[PDB]
Amino acid sequence: DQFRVGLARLARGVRERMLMGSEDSLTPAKLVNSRPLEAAIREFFSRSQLSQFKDETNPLSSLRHKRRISALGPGGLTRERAGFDVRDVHRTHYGRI
Amino acid sequence: KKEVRKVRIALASPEKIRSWSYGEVEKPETINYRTLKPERDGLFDERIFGPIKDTKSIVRRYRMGHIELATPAAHIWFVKDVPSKIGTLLDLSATELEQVLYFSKYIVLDPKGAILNGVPVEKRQLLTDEEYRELRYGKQETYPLPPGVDALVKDGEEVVKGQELAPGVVSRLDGVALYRFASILVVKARVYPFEDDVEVSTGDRVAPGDVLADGGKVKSDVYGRVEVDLVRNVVRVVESYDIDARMGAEAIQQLLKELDLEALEKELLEEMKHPSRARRAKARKRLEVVRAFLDSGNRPEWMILEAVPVLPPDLRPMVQVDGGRFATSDLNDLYRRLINRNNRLKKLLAQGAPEIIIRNEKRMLQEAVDALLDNGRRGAPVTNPGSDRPLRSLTDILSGKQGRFRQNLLGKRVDYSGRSVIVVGPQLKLHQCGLPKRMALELFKPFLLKKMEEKGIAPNVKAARRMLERQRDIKDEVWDALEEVIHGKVVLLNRAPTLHRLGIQAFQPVLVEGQSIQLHPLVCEAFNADFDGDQMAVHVPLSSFAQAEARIQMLSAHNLLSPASGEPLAKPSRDIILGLYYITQVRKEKKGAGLEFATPEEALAAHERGEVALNAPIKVAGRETSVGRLKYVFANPDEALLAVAHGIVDLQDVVTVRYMGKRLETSPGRILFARIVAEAVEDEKVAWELIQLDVPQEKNSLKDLVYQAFLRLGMEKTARLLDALKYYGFTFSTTSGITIGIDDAVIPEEKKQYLEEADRKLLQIEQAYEMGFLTDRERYDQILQLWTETTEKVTQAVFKNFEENYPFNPLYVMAQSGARGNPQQIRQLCGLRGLMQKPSGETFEVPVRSSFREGLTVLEYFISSHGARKGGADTALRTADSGYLTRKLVDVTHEIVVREADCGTTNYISVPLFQPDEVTRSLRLRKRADIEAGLYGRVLAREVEVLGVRLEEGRYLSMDDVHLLIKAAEAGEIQEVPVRSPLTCQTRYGVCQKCYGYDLSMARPVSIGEAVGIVAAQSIGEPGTQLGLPRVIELFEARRPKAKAVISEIDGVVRIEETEEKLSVFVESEGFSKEYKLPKEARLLVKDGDYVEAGQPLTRGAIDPHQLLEAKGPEAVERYLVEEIQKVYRAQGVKLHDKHIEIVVRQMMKYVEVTDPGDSRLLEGQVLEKWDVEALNERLIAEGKTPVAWKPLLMGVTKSALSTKSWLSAASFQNTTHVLTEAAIAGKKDELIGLKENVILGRLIPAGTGSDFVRFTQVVDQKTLKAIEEARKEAVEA
Amino acid sequence: GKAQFGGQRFGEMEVWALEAYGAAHTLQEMLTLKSDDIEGRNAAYEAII
DNA sequence: GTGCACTACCACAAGCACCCAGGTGGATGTGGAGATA
RNA sequence: CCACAUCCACCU
DNA sequence: TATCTCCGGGTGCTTGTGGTAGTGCAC
């Protein structure tokens, strides 16, 4: 998802460059620039909420941190202050959660 | 030198702003990157705020700047507040008219409006810029004409709609068309030819009847402007007269320039007194604002701001972070933006005047000013793109959960403090705590430096500091000096959640080796501190004044009883209770022979021989005495304990011991406990009479013992008794060997068939459902009832088995004593945890048959996880709700302090002793706990003699008096006790000593100067976290319950009509009848024909406090609130006294609103006591009998807290914006009464030691007193 | 923080407990002398030395 | 003197600003396009 | 220098 | 061409608006 967001930004950039650009033999450089997609990927892998510091206290800690499921995320899905209705477990969690 | 007494807040004139600032900032250049010095005259200029190099830099912390805007602007607070203060001072609509005038292209115009545009005379209407731009200059139309073509209309032709000005040109309205060669100009004007000199020149605007030109020959006919064209020698007069033209905040200023408050006030009075309440509501709403400006000095002319103040640079600093990058507050960005926009506006106004661009720039500047003053009220200006975080404005600094008020009211940081994990301190005394030596050395560093400077450890303090800076220089002499320093000092220990007053406790530190803080076990309940890894903080008071305070009134040895009730908190804990129960228990096993012993005197030898064999045990259940009492008789307790030491008899053995005066058939354990009590205290007779050596020492027995010892002995003796009890409980719990194994969770066999029986019944109900005899709800109720009955049956069977078979079972022993566990937990361990609640709130149909002694099935564990998650979430949220409630109560009640001479209150409350309704119609005595919580520690209103004892008026009710009154009520002498209460106290700010009462941490009556309000609020709020709560919220914050119960307001009789649409209950009286409609769900509780009184609940349900107050009165609603609040706390087992609830209820309704006006408006509500003072001044002190007829108004806790005379507490409590705006409209000289304001200012607290009753107390020793008194008497000559 | 441990919080609940007692000078010095008043804290340090 | 419409008052619905416990430890993050040098 | 944001934990 | 610089959930409140009954004009 983050990669396709960066790809959409790059698509807007290349469309603008083509609109400004006049000639045609400019495919390598004058169309695509790596800055938007690379910036988006780096931002996702650095400052995202789900990309979080590894807990290497012991192998069990690392494994559990690797197999954790979060209802939270970017912010538009689930948020801290009010989540009382969804905190309770469900009858379908049997064997899955 | 003079002391601060009042704090006044008011508006600041532009003259005041210019007086504050030292020069003006013009450049939006904060600081150059290359030159770290300030760049120019901008936000950090050197000469505008003071020297940045070491006067110190502190001048830059206080010197302010200013920006002189070329265009006036209005404070966002006075235009966007919910009552728009500018919008209510003027006759302008707040929501749309004010802002469309204040931002958009709209015009308001006072002076001239006589011009006609299809609308009558204009006074202050709001009209769009288009129609005003038209009526400014008449009605103008322009028509280009092709060259070389001559039109048919000449220069002076009147034209109507439809006239052909040319073969292709036609106009649309009546006017005059001027022709050129090369265009057509259609004007709505009247043309007059003339041939003489002009009287009115070009530019002047004229009124009808005035001479235009040619003398009296030509005169004006309508309003408009005169234009003279000598080409045809004609004067044209348009129908647009001189009318003002103003826009933006400047326009508003003109309004505020021309508004006079006295005439507006008189007009408001005249137009408010006559009409009904509909108009007079808003009339008084704006009249209060007008009076606020009029009486407070500062005029509203400067209510909008011309010069914007600029905060000192250090209050908005730019700091290097790393590699030259600057971190800056949003204040600098907002100031830079405002400066740049103002400079652009000045330049644009200087160069040229393109009207539309100028207007856009004016709107932009106004938006920038508003964003600087407060961000978020209109749009959301943000930082540089890429970081969508809104800028932080002045309001964000002020308001918010983390704002200037909530960081200075608290003192968030302390110098001499530390924190560490806590461990048990069993070897410590109750007035001692274990402090690690490294943190103790660090905390007492200056004292240690002084002490080692006193001796020869170091030459000077610098040498001592460099000696102590590295731990490799530590020496035994340093440790000895540190021990000498802290010989008498005390430290304050604190737990992170400070729920009540006992969360802070003083202790005498003892140096220990380690990293953890050693804590006495007995204070494990005063703090909510176990030893599972929690940490506690330590603080070190410095001044000898504070040291004396901490050692006297905050030492843990002096705080043994609760402030919420009389129950002690230093009671023996779980392990001590277990040990004392084990030592003071009597065992009985079996009787195997003829128990008959009273009659036969030869039976002694026969039964001794039987005990020699296995016929009868030593603790045999004989008729009169056991063989143990016969075999062993001890002259003294020492002999019995020495025989126990030899293993002959256990501590749990019945035996005859000759005590000081009697022969007792008791156990050596009970005798040893009695001796422990007798040696802990000095005298033994009192110790013997304050114990009960005939029962096992359960936790209630220990609590009663501690309370009696505190009452009859004092402070030191109670502490020593507690220490001895703790030590012996530890020793005997250790030696007794209580262990828990899987076999200790004994499963009774009978419960087995119980399940079978239930199962059979279950099956029956099942088939009862398959025959159609029951519904789903009926079946669910039957299953729930059956399972909840068999659960109780299994619990009873389990406890009966434990009593009968294994008296010394660890689970049963812990359950009987107050050590740990509940019968429900013991059942879950050994019986069954049947019923489990569904997440929807209901309960599962299928129970859990197994227990933890057995193995739970996977499904049962998955079901119990539901309850586990529910409990976790409920804790994690109800804690927050309880904290919010506690903050509300503390802020509303913080002003109550007992400062008093005994008020002459001939008023009281009659506390009932009988429950008015436990059945439909019956009276029974209230529970002992409720009566104790209502009566203990009160002051009798008047003398009462109930059982031949004269309880004199003004006597504090001790526990013995409460017991005597309860016994008398049981006998049937009295039903209500008249006692003083805070609810009837006449003290100005607080309650008096008599009306408050007698319950404290001590027993003695309350000392004068104690802040009873805060301790009351803490006592109410502390159990909330361990708690229902929404009911408490809706009672404290007066609201309308959803399930409202209909009540009657006038006495009468009940006439019930059962119409199927809606039941009709009629309150019938002699001259009138009232009717009430009750729906199907309205389940009432009255019978037809019964007499009904005012306020009597016709239906079952919650009662709205407001209508109850309107019906019965203040006292009735106060009693209802107190009882309802106490009900929920009783339901949870919490023992909370009524004094605190009465304090909060009195603070809840301390407001009245007058009906017959005196010297003020009518429909306004303020303090009851102020109105009482005004009435006393008006009727008696001064001449003029003007009754200020008021009615009491009941408002919630939040509303009462917000509406207060002192603006500091209200601003710091809930909402800074509205409170500060209200306190700025009228200069609010905040008198420094109340503890919150003094905390804000940091001065001495009016309560406690700072009370003027004890604030100053001259102290002189005997010899100096004798010398000065000798001087006095020698001044008295001869 | 990294340089020195930093002071312990005193919040408002601790303030409420402290003024629930009669302690007024303790609160006065712990809000001004030991917390904020720079001249006060400097003078107190010098006097204690 | 009564039938009719009228206009001021009231219960109900909608838009809006404001609340949402205390304390501690640790970790990582804070620029991309235009314009002028 | 410690500002703010985000995340993970610990004690209630 | 390089570097620097510009490009929500819940509660109290207010207001509104059609509803509703007192009262003004016509039968």
Ligand SMILES: [Mg+2]
């Ligand atoms: Mg703990």
Ligand SMILES: [Zn+2]
């Ligand atoms: Zn009193």
